[PDB]
Amino acid sequence: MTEYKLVVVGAGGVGKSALTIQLIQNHFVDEYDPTIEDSYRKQVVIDGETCLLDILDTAGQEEYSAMRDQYMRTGEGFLCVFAINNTKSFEDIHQYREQIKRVKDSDDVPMVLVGNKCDLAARTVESRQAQDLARSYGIPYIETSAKTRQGVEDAFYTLVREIRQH
Amino acid sequence: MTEYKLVVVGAGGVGKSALTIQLIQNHFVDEYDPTIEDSYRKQVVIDGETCLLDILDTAGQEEYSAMRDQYMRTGEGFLCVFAINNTKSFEDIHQYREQIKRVKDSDDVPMVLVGNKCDLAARTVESRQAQDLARSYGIPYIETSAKTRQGVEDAFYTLVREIRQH
Ligand SMILES: CNc1ccccc1C(=O)O[C@H]1C[C@H](n2cnc3c(=O)[nH]c(N)nc32)O[C@@H]1COP(=O)(O)OP(=O)(O)NP(=O)(O)O
Ligand SMILES: CNc1ccccc1C(=O)O[C@H]1C[C@H](n2cnc3c(=O)[nH]c(N)nc32)O[C@@H]1COP(=O)(O)OP(=O)(O)NP(=O)(O)O
Ligand SMILES: [Mg+2]
Ligand SMILES: [Mg+2]
């Protein structure tokens, strides 16, 4: 079975985990619960293809210092998430893209830029500003909302689509 | 307003029109109605971006001989659809990809390969076979069902995503 090793990175607090749980077990966790490392595995059919999604939920805090280096070594594709109401988590993105190209040895790694939490009105990261980050990376920009599930499957499946042509 | 000129090509009968109507006016047309040329325009918000989708529904029959050349001249991105229960409509795809590169002057035009009608069990085009067409084009493969709307927005939005990095 084609297995897809997806890796959800991003600053602490952006909804990394709320998005994986949304995708996987069909409900929003409106709750403070910091991750260390949760992995998830699920039979899915993506575009007729039957495959296992083996997603590794990660912590955003660099208490997970170079413990990061390990999984970015093994991750095939990555969800880079930031919250659209948090310019700082946007500005952290360049940091992850850098570490990932680092351990991963390549300038172009399958990746998706994901502007999560779009359901809310206090947005400080404008869309085109994010669409301009994504384009300079040559990656897709997908806005999501783990609350309303808008974009949730879009962001995860497009990345599987990415890993394919790579 | 960013306008996206999408063009839905493909053999006669594959569901080209059922997919545009699904996207646009939220219901399946289980009905014989051959197209000549229907255009559609709709305000959408794709990834925070507010934009007009100006889709041109097309006929599959080459009674629309070189009347094709005109719109493929002007279309920015294209939905290439075939029915997964119709090996012939799959084999027609290379024909459209060829005409499109023709009038369009470029080897790589934003495009989406779309294996529509996936809800049904009489499938003669296997997914990976189609996933191998798509990859040799270096384009996304998206299976849809205008009946159940599975993939319907996926296929149209990913193409808008395509036109972006182009
Ligand atoms: C009662 N609620 C709180 C009180 C105090 C502190 C925190 C919260 C809290 O639970 O907020 C949560 C949900 C919210 N969340 C996730 N995704 C979305 C989204 O799409 N929209 C909205 N509106 N909220 C979201 O985003 C916050 C963090 O979610 P998470 O999924 O745990 O975030 P993470 O990316 O996994 N952070 P980490 O790196 O620590 O694991
Ligand atoms: C009572 N029904 C018929 C009787 C006789 C002849 C034709 C039909 C008939 O209506 O079949 C339709 C719907 C079906 N359709 C479209 N999409 C789907 C899909 O996703 N799944 C299924 N199950 N059917 C679909 O696909 C057929 C063609 O749909 P269309 O959307 O009109 O196809 P087109 O691609 O626009 N053909 P064209 O080039 O002529 O405009
Ligand atoms: Mg968490
Ligand atoms: Mg029609």
Side-chain angles (χ1 to χ4, degrees):
Chain A
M1 207 182 29
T2 301
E3 295 214 320
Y4 289 112
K5 310 307 195 176
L6 314 309
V7 188
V8 203
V9 309
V14 293
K16 287 184 309 276
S17 310
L19 284 170
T20 314
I21 293 292
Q22 194 56 286
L23 180 80
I24 269 124
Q25 66 208 50
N26 306 134
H27 85 103
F28 179 54
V29 289
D30 212 353
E31 264 180 61
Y32 194 98
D33 192 50
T35 323
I36 292 83
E37 233 208 17
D38 298 322
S39 188
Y40 294 102
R41 287 151 94 16
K42 188 181 171 49
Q43 197 278 127
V44 283
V45 198
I46 304 179
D47 312 321
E49 198 201 54
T50 197
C51 52
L52 192 153
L53 239 36
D54 180 78
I55 299 132
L56 160 91
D57 202 332
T58 64
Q61 243 283 35
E62 190 97 87
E63 52 97 303
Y64 233 48
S65 38
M67 339 218 128
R68 226 103 79 160
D69 288 63
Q70 246 206 327
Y71 54 78
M72 277 169 193
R73 193 87 43 51
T74 27
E76 292 194 282
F78 296 90
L79 283 201
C80 294
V81 202
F82 67 92
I84 51 70
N85 63 331
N86 208 120
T87 37
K88 184 172 59 204
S89 63
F90 189 56
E91 276 159 16
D92 284 350
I93 278 310
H94 175 91
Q95 274 107 93
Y96 293 83
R97 156 113 184 160
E98 285 307 292
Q99 181 153 156
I100 295 162
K101 300 161 44 153
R102 222 273 231 86
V103 315
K104 200 81 248 191
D105 225 39
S106 96
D107 286 296
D108 278 56
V109 185
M111 262 182 271
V112 168
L113 184 47
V114 169
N116 182 57
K117 298 195 184 178
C118 70
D119 61 290
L120 62 75
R123 75 182 300 150
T124 56
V125 167
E126 225 34 79
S127 166
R128 213 196 293 286
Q129 168 196 283
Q131 179 72 71
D132 280 0
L133 190 47
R135 176 151 220 201
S136 87
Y137 295 163
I139 57 174
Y141 182 58
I142 301 180
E143 291 206 352
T144 68
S145 180
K147 195 158 188 72
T148 64
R149 202 174 168 111
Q150 222 270 326
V152 168
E153 295 190 342
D154 226 353
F156 269 105
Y157 291 171
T158 285
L159 179 62
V160 156
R161 231 99 71 181
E162 277 282 306
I163 305 169
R164 302 225 247 238
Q165 266 101 50
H166 186 298
Chain B
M1 207 182 29
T2 301
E3 295 214 320
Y4 289 112
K5 310 307 195 176
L6 314 309
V7 188
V8 203
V9 309
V14 293
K16 287 184 309 276
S17 310
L19 284 170
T20 314
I21 293 292
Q22 194 56 286
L23 180 80
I24 269 124
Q25 66 208 50
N26 306 134
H27 85 103
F28 179 54
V29 289
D30 212 353
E31 264 180 61
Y32 194 98
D33 192 50
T35 323
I36 292 83
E37 233 208 17
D38 298 322
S39 188
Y40 294 102
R41 287 151 94 16
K42 188 181 171 49
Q43 197 278 127
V44 283
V45 198
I46 304 179
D47 312 321
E49 198 201 54
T50 197
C51 52
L52 192 153
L53 239 36
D54 180 78
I55 299 132
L56 160 91
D57 202 332
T58 64
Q61 243 283 35
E62 190 97 87
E63 52 97 303
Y64 233 48
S65 38
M67 339 218 128
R68 226 103 79 160
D69 288 63
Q70 246 206 327
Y71 54 78
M72 277 169 193
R73 193 87 43 51
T74 27
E76 292 194 282
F78 296 90
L79 283 201
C80 294
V81 202
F82 67 92
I84 51 70
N85 63 331
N86 208 120
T87 37
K88 184 172 59 204
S89 63
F90 189 56
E91 276 159 16
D92 284 350
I93 278 310
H94 175 90
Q95 274 107 93
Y96 293 83
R97 156 113 184 160
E98 285 307 292
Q99 181 153 156
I100 295 162
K101 300 161 44 153
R102 222 273 231 86
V103 315
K104 200 81 248 191
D105 225 39
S106 96
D107 286 296
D108 278 56
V109 185
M111 262 182 271
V112 168
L113 184 47
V114 169
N116 182 57
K117 298 195 184 178
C118 70
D119 61 290
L120 62 75
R123 75 182 300 150
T124 56
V125 167
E126 225 34 79
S127 166
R128 213 196 293 286
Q129 168 196 283
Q131 179 72 71
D132 280 0
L133 190 47
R135 176 151 220 201
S136 87
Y137 295 163
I139 57 174
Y141 182 58
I142 301 181
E143 291 206 352
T144 68
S145 180
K147 195 158 188 72
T148 64
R149 202 174 168 111
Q150 222 270 326
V152 168
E153 295 190 342
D154 226 353
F156 269 105
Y157 291 171
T158 285
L159 179 62
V160 156
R161 231 99 71 181
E162 277 282 306
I163 305 169
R164 302 225 247 238
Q165 266 101 50
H166 186 298

